[PDB]
Design a protein around this ligand. Structure first.
Ligand SMILES: Nc1ncnc2c1ncn2[C@@H]1O[C@H](CSCC[C@H](N)C(=O)O)[C@@H](O)[C@H]1O
Ligand SMILES: [Mg+2]
Lengths: 55, 301, 386, 268, 79, 46, 58, 108, 216
RNA sequence: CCGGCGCGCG
């Protein structure tokens, strides 16, 4: 039963892109001491063809 | 005595099959008259049922477009005359009547042998005229219905001929009250007052289902008994009761936690188990001490 | 934990959760249109003698109050048998707070062992009471009494000595916590004779009640008035619906009484205060079925509406306009409850068969060959001359 | 109807899709052979219509009016079963067909092979044929009744001597939903003026004109009054409030288009 | 589905080639599993859904939907 | 959607120009749904 | 089609001239159910084909 | 079959002797739950053809007798044991048939 | 048998509730009448609670702005018009606002009459920068939708923001059946199920009086 | 299951 049981990037970073038709699918932006990076926010299931990640 | 009254301000019987009535209803709050008027008009024009002949059986007729020797009117004219007979009845079902006369003479609506549950509105309604003494036997079918539809007869069941209403300002804008008038025209099968009362009752029966219990609320006349039968069956081959049928009332919780769960729309044990700790933490007056004590209480169960 | 008490205020209904149990029934008069009754006598069922029950149990009032959007809790005892568990579940799914319901494993729900004396005329001399008669003073849930703002109880709880003591304790505890005490008389069957012993039984609880609801028959019985009106006659004369002056209800008044409600079903409700008095006319031409003839659903709905309106605005118990609006709301609630019960139970035709109002108003085809409504063979015709 | 749908008479549909209905009958073991299925179809059994409705889903048809003057004279639609004996046609595709409802008729064709069905679905449907090939103007533009409705809706307030009998020497709404709700409760008319609080950028089409009147307060705040909006500014703060003078009709048109876009975005 | 069809053509240089490829894929689907198509499942709809699903956008299989409010067997919705 | 707020009138020329601009900006699939909604609104107000 | 010695090709019906939700778009006509169950516009039509008399063929 | 019996006939029946359980129905003609209980009792008497006896006593005509039995309302059933040693059961309300069968098979 | 059920429910925020309800089986023409009556009742016969009047104490000089408050008087009134309340009050009561000084004044800073609650405590009213006590005397009423230097507030009593009905028809031959769908949007002061029940009760109460009879 | 003539509808 449900009851018995690197940092995230600045949201404005993606928000300024998002309001301008930038779309990121299945990935999230993370920041570390080395710098920015893109990481899969979930499990990307391998499909028949290439999958769209960002636009 | 009543602050809001209704009365018949005019009643008129223009003919045997055309009654008139005007009714008043004041004082009404602003906007109530429009709702009452539109709902009452739609109920009068669509929700009131009537009785009429729907099927007539002949014996020696090739088709409904033929003549009979000795009767001035053809079969089609006889059927058209039969379609105009206005009847009244409070019961449902396909009753049957009989026309069994010998000529010559005039066949009026008082020549129909009716079952005790059906009455004739107009005795003088014409069906056919017999010029010579020929036998004539017609078997009829009568049922009560709404709207409109052995030779079939296109029966129009609506007994209200027309309706109208008007809304007038009561006066000074203390509460901006209103006056409602309703005009009803019927065919004599029921008076305009009877039509008004029947429309009110039909509207209430149309709106009252929403005040029942929601579909799939009790376990499936007396909703208690099926659940008792379920409990009896569960007593044999002991399998206990499902968590959905067990409520948080029967679990010993502190009153604050009980109220917290209740206003969060948590009622049954299955809902409690489906809930997560984070969501309960999101709800105020519910600290980690409450979480752990509730978990201990559930573990004790 | 006063900050967790929300809106509307909680109401505690103290008593028994019976299933279709009627205390009593007295001859009654209702407002009716008799031209319609004559016209629709073949399609609308009516009782030959109009007899009205004052209401039902406390569980019924708790269920009715919850259906109005109010907050209701039931205080009582139920057994662990199948009947008791079923009744508890039925109360639970009706949004009635059952945390104040005490469950006893040593008691049987709705069953009492009775010792009949077989020497003279049979008495019954109750020995072991039922489950919903054995609520001890220690089993009273005090938390719901603190949370609740109004306490409701009936006279059925005063029939047993232990039940009477528990009821007195609960009333006193609620009074200490600043609650409004609602006493719904609903006079049981054995108490309708020997007015004196009824007064002896109900004198103490009567003085501890802020709001009291009685029927017209109950008020006449308690005031020693013989009904002079006529019953079961096709008219609506004002003598059948008389608004007694406050002098008539003067002997029944006490220091802490705020409102007295005298109900005549949903036809008329009379309210009495120390400064205002009046009546509100209603409607009792609701669909009635042989399964719903006692009209107890109307009484439960009326009481539930009165409780709801008194709890939502407790500072207007003396406002005449608010009392009139409360009476009208109670009339409407009773009418709706009676209509719903008529639809649910249906007409007579667990062995329980019922037919709908549509089936009840369906006649036979009258297609009997011997009948005068069928084309007989030409041998037997019997033409009538025009 | 939707822009991509048409209504087919039951008799025409059962005639055109007869083989597919036969296959649907045989496939679910409700017909022993082809002859039994054809006999069942001929008897108009109630189960024939279930199979017809099932097999018409996803199978397009081609409609065609008689004088095919350009390529938009034949288009593809998704057929649905309608009662009666007439073909139900969308009002917005009548201009391309040059069709009016005073006696005109149309022919219906069923693409059989998969390639033809794909061609009809991906090339001939009306939602990818919104522009005319002659010059590029839109072809499914509202006309006549819709045009009059929009014109009346967006016809603004009566102004000047048509609004007041004498020389003058309106409700304020927090949001458009409040204004439309007041309109529903008959508090205001369709063309009664009102002030709408604007919480977006200045995007109201109006004449490029300076304010009629500027009401400058000694505390710093000044009110700029234009012909169609009021703007409140201050010298102390960076606040900027905008109120648009409009009617319920303009708000309704804007909300209709905005809600169409938002609903289409959410549904995908 | 109209939005999906528009989106799929945003990556196609030639729409005629897109239609031909969709038809070929639907033909392969029908030849491989003949009995699964023609009723509630259409081969072209399945191809379009799979092509949309291949991009990572979840869609119902072949855009197949029914009415949960049908009042039992035999009852046909009237438009 | 960054739509301009028309506040004067919508005539035959304006609706034709508006639809053409919507196709360029939003595409034929979006505009096909906008046309369906606008058609109902125009019918409902007539 | 002749009443009282006059040509009578039609009926006198109550009529309004207004747009109604697009159901009279272009040249469409919206009518009431009263014209149907009242048999206002019912006509007899007879074909000829080169069977029991009074039978309902199908 | 349920027979309407007066106060004195019930007096005689209980003061007499019997080998089968006796169920007494306390009812009134103005109660709907009384009609529902009558239907339940008729079904039960169908189930118990001769091994039990079900009788009905009208409360409105035997009000003093009903008070003597501490009948606090309607519907009310009394299960009278044939053995004088055992105690009688008074049931209040519209109880289900399974409770009736359980009483008759356990404490009868 | 004629039954009803909730087929969809949502809570987008604390002041945006949605629900979809069903009612079947119905006869021909009944669903349209029921939907029309229910929509009218939902839109105008349901009582709502709103602030209808505001009195500005502490001598604001009856000017457009008050020293220390970021928002103007008109802006404050517009903010007050947006506060969603629920109550059972009969007549008219009074509410008060007393915020000590700097900070944000929200709905939470309103002292309410007994039966009045606040749906959203985060609704902004005014912003205070300098330490000046602000005294506003609110007037709260409960009214139907279809119904001294104190500034009025043009309150619109619409607890149900929107309502719609739709009809689905089915049939196999000569027997038909239709289904009624009702959509209700409320501002959180009342649930869509509560709105449905209240609309039904108000309609029934509107049609009870036609069955009234009088004493002879 | 073929062609002419006449009358119509969009
Ligand atoms: N695999 C890798 N390991 C370490 N640094 C990398 C790398 N790939 C790219 N970079 C660094 O990242 C830069 C590319 S821009 C990439 C994001 C950048 N790190 C930022 O935070 O903004 C290059 O200058 C390179 O120095
Ligand atoms: Mg044409």
């Amino acid at each position: 039963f449900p009851l018995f049981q690197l940092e995230s990037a600045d949201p404005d970073f993606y928000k300024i892109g998002y309001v301008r038709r930038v779309r990121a699918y299945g990935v999230e932006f993370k920041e570390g001491p080395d710098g920015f990076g893109i990481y899969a926010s979930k499990d990307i299931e391998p499909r028949r063809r290439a999958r769209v990640i960002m636009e | 005595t009543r602050t809001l009254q209704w009365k018949c301000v005019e009643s008129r019987r223009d003919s045997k099959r055309l009654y008139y009535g005007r009714f008043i209803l004041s004082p009404l709050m602003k906007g109530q008259a429009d709702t009452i008027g539109i709902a009452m008009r739609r109920a009068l024009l669509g929700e009131i049922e009537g009785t009429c002949i729907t099927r007539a059986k002949f014996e020696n007729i090739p088709h409904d477009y033929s003549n009979i020797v000795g009767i001035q009117e053809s079969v089609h004219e006889i059927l058209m005359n039969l379609n105009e007979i206005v009847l009244k009845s409070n019961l449902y079902g396909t009753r049957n009547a009989l026309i069994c006369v010998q000529g010559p003479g005039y066949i009026t609506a008082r020549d129909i042998i009716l079952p005790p549950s059906v009455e004739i509105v107009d005795n003088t309604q014409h069906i056919a005229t017999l010029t010579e003494p020929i036998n004539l036997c017609i078997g009829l079918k009568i049922e009560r219905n709404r709207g409109y539809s052995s030779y079939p007869i296109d029966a129009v069941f609506m007994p209200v001929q027309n309706a109208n209403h008007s809304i007038h300002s009561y006066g000074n804008g203390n509460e901006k009250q209103e006056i409602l008038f309703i005009e009803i025209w019927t065919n004599g099968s029921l008076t305009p007052k009877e039509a008004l009362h029947e429309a009110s009752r039909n509207l209430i029966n149309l709106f009252i289902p929403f005040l029942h219990v929601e579909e799939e609320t009790f376990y499936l006349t007396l909703p208690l008994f099926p659940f008792h039968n379920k409990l009896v069956n569960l007593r044999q081959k002991k399998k206990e009761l499902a968590f959905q049928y067990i409520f948080i009332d029967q679990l010993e919780l502190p009153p604050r936690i009980y109220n917290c769960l209740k206003k969060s729309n948590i009622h049954t044990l299955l809902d409690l188990l489906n809930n997560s700790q984070e969501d309960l933490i999101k709800m105020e007056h519910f600290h980690i001490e409450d979480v752990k004590k509730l978990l201990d209480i559930l573990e004790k169960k | 934990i006063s900050h967790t008490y929300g809106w509307p205020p909680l109401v505690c209904c103290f008593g028994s959760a019976q299933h279709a149990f009627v205390p009593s029934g007295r001859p009654a008069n209702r407002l009716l249109d008799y031209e319609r009754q004559e016209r629709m006598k073949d399609a609308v069922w009516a009782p030959e003698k109009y007899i009205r029950a004052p209401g039902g149990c406390a569980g019924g009032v708790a269920i009715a109050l919850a259906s109005l959007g109010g907050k209701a809790a039931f205080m009582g005892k139920l057994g662990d048998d199948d009947f008791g568990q079923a009744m508890l579940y039925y109360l639970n799914v009706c949004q009635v707070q059952t945390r104040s319901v005490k469950i006893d494993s040593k008691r049987v729900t709705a069953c009492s062992t009775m010792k009949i004396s077989k020497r003279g005329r049979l008495k019954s001399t109750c020995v072991k009471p039922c489950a919903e008669d054995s609520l001890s003073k220690s089993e009273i849930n005090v938390d719901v009494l603190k949370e609740a703002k109004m306490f409701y109880f009936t006279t059925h709880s005063l029939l047993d000595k232990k039940m009477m003591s528990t009821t007195l304790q609960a009333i006193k505890i609620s009074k200490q916590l600043g609650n409004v005490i609602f006493y719904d008389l609903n006079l049981p069957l054995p108490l309708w004779q020997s007015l004196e012993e009824t007064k002896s039984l109900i004198q103490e609880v009567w003085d501890l009640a802020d709001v009291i609801e009685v029927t017209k028959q109950e008020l006449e019985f308690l005031c020693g008035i013989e009904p002079t009106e006529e019953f079961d006659t096709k008219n609506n004369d004002s003598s059948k619906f008389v608004h007694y002056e406050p002098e008539t209800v003067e002997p029944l008044w006490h220091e802490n009484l705020k409102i007295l409600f005298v109900t005549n079903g949903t036809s008329k409700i009379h309210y009495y205060t120390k400064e205002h008095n009046g009546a509100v006319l209603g409607m009792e031409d609701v669909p009635i079925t042989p399964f719903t003839r006692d009209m107890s659903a109307s009484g439960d709905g009326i009481v539930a509406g009165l409780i709801r309106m008194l709890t939502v605005q407790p500072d207007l118990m003396n406002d005449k306009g608010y009392l009139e609006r409360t009476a009208r709301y109670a009339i409407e609630c009773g009418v709706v409850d009676q209509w719903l019960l008529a639809q649910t139970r249906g007409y007579p035709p667990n062995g329980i068969r019922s037919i709908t109002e549509r089936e009840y108003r369906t006649s036979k085809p009258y297609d009997e060959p011997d009948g005068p409504y069928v084309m007989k063979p030409v041998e037997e015709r019997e033409y009538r001359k025009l | 109807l939707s822009l991509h749908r048409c209504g087919l008479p039951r008799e025409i549909a059962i005639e055109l899709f007869q083989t597919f209905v036969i296959r649907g009958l045989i496939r679910q073991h409700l017909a022993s052979n082809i002859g039994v299925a054809k006999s069942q179809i001929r008897e108009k059994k109630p189960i024939v219509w279930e199979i017809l409705q099932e097999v018409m889903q996803g199978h397009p048809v081609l409609l065609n009016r008689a004088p095919t003057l350009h390529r938009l004279g034949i288009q593809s639609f998704q057929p649905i079963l309608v009662e009666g004996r007439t073909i139900c046609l969308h009002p917005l595709v009548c201009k391309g067909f040059n069709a009016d409802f005073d006696g005109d008729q149309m022919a219906v064709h069923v693409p059989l092979s998969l390639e033809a069905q794909a061609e009809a679905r991906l090339l001939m449907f009306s939602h990818m044929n919104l522009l005319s090939p002659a010059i590029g103007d839109p072809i499914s533009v509202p006309t006549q009744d819709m045009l009059i409705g929009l014109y009346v809706l967006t016809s603004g307030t009566r102004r000047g001597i048509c609004a007041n009998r004498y020389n003058p020497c309106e409700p304020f709404f927090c949001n458009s939903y409040d204004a439309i709700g007041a309109y529903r409760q008959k508090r205001i008319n369709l063309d009664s003026p009102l002030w709408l609080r604007w919480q977006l950028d200045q995007r109201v089409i109006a004449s490029k004109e300076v304010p009629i009147e500027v009401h400058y307060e000694s505390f710093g705040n000044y009110h700029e009054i234009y012909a169609h909006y009021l703007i409140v500014r201050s010298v102390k703060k960076e606040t900027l409030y905008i109120y648009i003078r409009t009617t319920v009709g303009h708000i309704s048109f804007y909300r209709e288009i905005e809600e169409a876009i938002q609903g289409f975005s959410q549904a995908c | 589905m109209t939005m999906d069809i528009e989106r799929l053509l945003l990556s196609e240089d030639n729409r005629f080639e897109f239609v031909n490829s969709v038809a070929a894929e639907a033909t392969e689907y029908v030849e491989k599993n003949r009995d699964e198509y023609g009723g509630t499942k259409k081969a072209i709809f399945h191809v379009l859904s799979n092509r949309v699903n291949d991009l990572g956008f979840d869609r119902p299989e072949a855009y197949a939907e029914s009415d949960p409010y049908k009042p039992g067997p035999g009852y046909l919705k009237e438009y | 959607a960054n739509l301009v707020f028309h506040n004067k009138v919508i005539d035959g020329t304006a609706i034709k120009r508006l639809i053409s601009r919507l196709i360029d900006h939003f595409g034929m699939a979006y505009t096909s749904h906008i046309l369906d909604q606008v058609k109902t609104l125009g019918f409902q107000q007539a | 089609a002749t009443v009282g010695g006059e040509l009578a090709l039609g009926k006198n019906v109550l009529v309004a001239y207004m747009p109604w939700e697009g159901y009279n778009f272009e040249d469409a006509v919206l009518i009431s159910e009263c014209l149907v169950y009242g048999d206002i516009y019912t006509s007899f039509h007879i074909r000829k084909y080169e069977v029991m008399l009074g039978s309902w063929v199908e | 079959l349920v027979r309407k019996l007066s106060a004195q006939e019930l007096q005689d029946l209980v003061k007499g002797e019997r080998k089968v359980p006796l169920i007494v129905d306390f009812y009134a003609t103005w109660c709907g739950p009384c009609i529902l209980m009558a239907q339940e009792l008729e079904m039960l008497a169908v189930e118990y053809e001769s091994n039990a006896m079900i009788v009905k006593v009208d409360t409105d005509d035997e009000y003093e007798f009903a008070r003597d039995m501490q009948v606090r309302g309607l519907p009310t059933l009394f299960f009278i044991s044939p053995d004088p040693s055992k105690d009688a059961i008074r049931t209040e309300g519209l109880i289900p048939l399974q409770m009736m069968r359980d009483i008759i098979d356990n404490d009868m």
